[PDB]
Scaffold this active site. Structure first.
Site, PDB file in Angstrom:
ATOM      1  N   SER A 203       0.835  -1.214   0.000  1.00  0.00           N
ATOM      2  CA  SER A 203       0.000   0.000   0.000  1.00  0.00           C
ATOM      3  C   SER A 203       0.902   1.311   0.000  1.00  0.00           C
ATOM      4  O   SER A 203       1.438   1.490  -1.283  1.00  0.00           O
ATOM      5  CB  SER A 203      -0.842   0.013   1.346  1.00  0.00           C
ATOM      6  N   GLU A 327     -10.781  -3.096  -0.903  1.00  0.00           N
ATOM      7  CA  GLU A 327      -9.767  -2.063  -0.738  1.00  0.00           C
ATOM      8  C   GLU A 327     -10.252  -0.824   0.031  1.00  0.00           C
ATOM      9  O   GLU A 327      -9.463  -0.149   0.707  1.00  0.00           O
ATOM     10  CB  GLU A 327      -9.255  -1.633  -2.127  1.00  0.00           C
ATOM     11  N   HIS A 440      -7.717  -3.961   3.137  1.00  0.00           N
ATOM     12  CA  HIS A 440      -6.332  -3.892   2.673  1.00  0.00           C
ATOM     13  C   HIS A 440      -5.318  -4.100   3.802  1.00  0.00           C
ATOM     14  O   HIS A 440      -5.455  -3.564   4.912  1.00  0.00           O
ATOM     15  CB  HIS A 440      -6.032  -2.633   1.839  1.00  0.00           C
TER      16      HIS A 440
END
Length: 535
Positions: A203, A327, A440
């Site tokens: 990320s 997400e 996520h």
């Protein structure tokens, strides 16, 4: 020396190291923890590029994790595992530039492929010592050499007065590059092969990896790359020079402060004062925006990441990219009204409209109208469950899924071998509610093979699944191909191509191949939405 373990004494360019023998479930591994790679970025060195660590005398003890880089600590859900696992697990300090190495025990005689982990945390948090980044399992089961480093986050790593000498920006990215250089020179002392180095991160870690690809001086330092749920392109991973300058000057005002005199004052401020005002410099009320991120400086980044991937030569590049099923869900509880971990977060249509402004904070009224139009289900425009899930989809697609699709296509069309996945398995151990699905960062524990630890209460299918993923990742690191050449009838993972757009699903079931990474929806974000900004 004399009386200690022969396998735990290693020499690197800067001096001698003593490591530790650790227990993995299938046997022992060697760990070298808290190896310094830079001079401590303190005092006059704050905001400055890192200088390489000067050599030391005697044998440096490398048996424990070192300091975690100074950062904001999360307080949203006190006591709650789902947030705490990401919190710092060692003392906060500006003296934090250390890296870690895990190798097989005993260390391999033939040279071994190297995996380098770069953590996420939105460029304001993170640490290589968190339990989910434990290299022991990949070292033990797959015979890998695994390296992870700390890099400066928040202001310390990313505050920039672009142009100046004393705060040039992107220095957290430079901390990462210094560690990559340290791997090149020293990793063969541990049995690692410097000519087989794979970067992987998740990320802002993924976005970090992406920036190393786009930055020439980093390109010589690695050969393959994995990007999990993150891209250098997209709405949150970079700011313009102007925007960085503005946020930096504002933050200075907030703490009591010609660039030189400004920075000199900033350097006299305690670390904690800067962390205390870090969140007050954002232009709009928002989620999935972070105050101090990589800047487009015309140096580390010669142009915008969007521009660099449109016009880039990626002939010699193998890349694995992917996303998790949900997400967008994680950050909704951090400031979209209506959302919480403690209920089902069924929201109203009004809360959805408000949510869209917060989740797409750069949209004009018209662009926000377009988002709302696209994501409303016009059969059930007021249905609380759809609206809740649509809000999650808006955040996820805008910030990750569509940036990733954009990146995968531009890489494939320009030489790169690209493999693509969507991770869809929600861990049995997850502490977040069911409505958040697979948020996520919840693939990470599987890639690192935590389920192999019997004390963690993962199911047996989760243990087999973890091994499957470790194989995919380490095959890719070795060969540029997630598949096993041996086992040939278990379904293959096709490269992602502009023509066919194939990617696989990752869950307890065997690989399923799919086509189109949210193709209709991503046309909206990647093609149409920019045109609407120009009105």
């Amino acid at each position: 020396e004399g009386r200690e373990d022969p396998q735990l004494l290693v020499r690197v360019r800067g001096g001698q190291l003593r490591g530790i023998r650790l227990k993995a479930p299938g046997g022992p591994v060697s760990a070298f923890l808290g190896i310094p790679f830079a001079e401590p970025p303190v005092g006059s060195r704050r905001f400055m590029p890192p200088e390489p660590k000067r050599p030391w005398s005697g044998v440096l003890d490398a048996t424990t994790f070192q300091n975690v880089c100074y950062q904001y600590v999360d307080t949203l859900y006190p006591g709650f595992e789902g947030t705490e696992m990401w919190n710092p697990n060692r003392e906060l300090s500006e003296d934090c530039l250390y890296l870690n190495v895990w190798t097989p025990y005993p260390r391999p005689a033939s040279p071994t492929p190297v995996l380098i982990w770069i953590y996420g945390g939105g460029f304001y948090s993170g640490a290589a010592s968190l339990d989910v980044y434990d290299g022991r399992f990949l070292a033990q089961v797959e015979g890998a050499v695994l390296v992870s480093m700390n890099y400066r986050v928040g202001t310390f790593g990313f505050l920039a007065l672009p142009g100046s000498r004393e705060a040039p920006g992107n220095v957290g990215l430079l901390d990462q590059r210094l560690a990559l250089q340290w791997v090149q020179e020293n990793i063969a002392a541990f049995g690692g092969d410097p000519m087989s180095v794979t970067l992987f991160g998740e990320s802002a870690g993924a976005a970090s990896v992406g920036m190393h690809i786009l930055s020439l001086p980093s390109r010589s330092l690695f050969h393959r790359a994995v990007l999990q749920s993150g891209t250098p392109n997209g709405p949150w991973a970079t700011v313009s020079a102007g925007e960085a300058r503005r946020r930096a000057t504002l933050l200075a005002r907030l703490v009591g402060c010609n660039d030189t005199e400004l920075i000199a004052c900033l350097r006299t401020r305690p670390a904690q004062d800067l962390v205390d005002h870090e969140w007050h410099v954002l232009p709009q009320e928002s989620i999935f925006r972070f105050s101090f991120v990589p800047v487009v400086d015309g140096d580390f980044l010669s142009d915008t990441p969007e521009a660099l991937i449109n016009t880039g030569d990626f002939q010699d590049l193998q890349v694995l990219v992917g996303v998790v099923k949900d997400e967008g869900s994680y950050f909704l509880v951090y400031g979209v009204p209506g959302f919480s971990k403690d209920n089902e977060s069924l929201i109203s249509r009004a809360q959805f409209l408000a949510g869209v402004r917060i989740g797409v904070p750069q949209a004009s009224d018209l662009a926000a109208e377009a988002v709302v139009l696209h994501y409303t289900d016009w059969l059930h425009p007021e249905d609380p469950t759809h609206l809740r899930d649509a809000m999650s989809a808006v955040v996820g697609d805008h910030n990750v899924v569509c940036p990733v699709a954009q990146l995968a296509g531009r890489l494939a069309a320009q030489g790169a071998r690209v493999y693509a996945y969507i991770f869809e398995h929600r861990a049995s151990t997850l502490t977040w509610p069911l409505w958040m699905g697979v948020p996520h960062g919840y693939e990470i524990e599987f890639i690192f093979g935590l389920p192999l630890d019997p004390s963690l209460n993962y199911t047996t299918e989760e243990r087999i699944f973890a091994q499957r993923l470790m194989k995919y990742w380490t095959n890719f690191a070795r060969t540029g191909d997630p598949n096993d050449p041996r086992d040939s009838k278990s379904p293959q993972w096709p490269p992602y191509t502009t023509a066919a757009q194939q990617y696989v699903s990752l869950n307890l079931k065997p690989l399923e191949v799919r086509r189109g990474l949210r193709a209709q929806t991503c046309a909206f974000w990647n093609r149409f939405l920019p045109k609407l900004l120009s009105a």
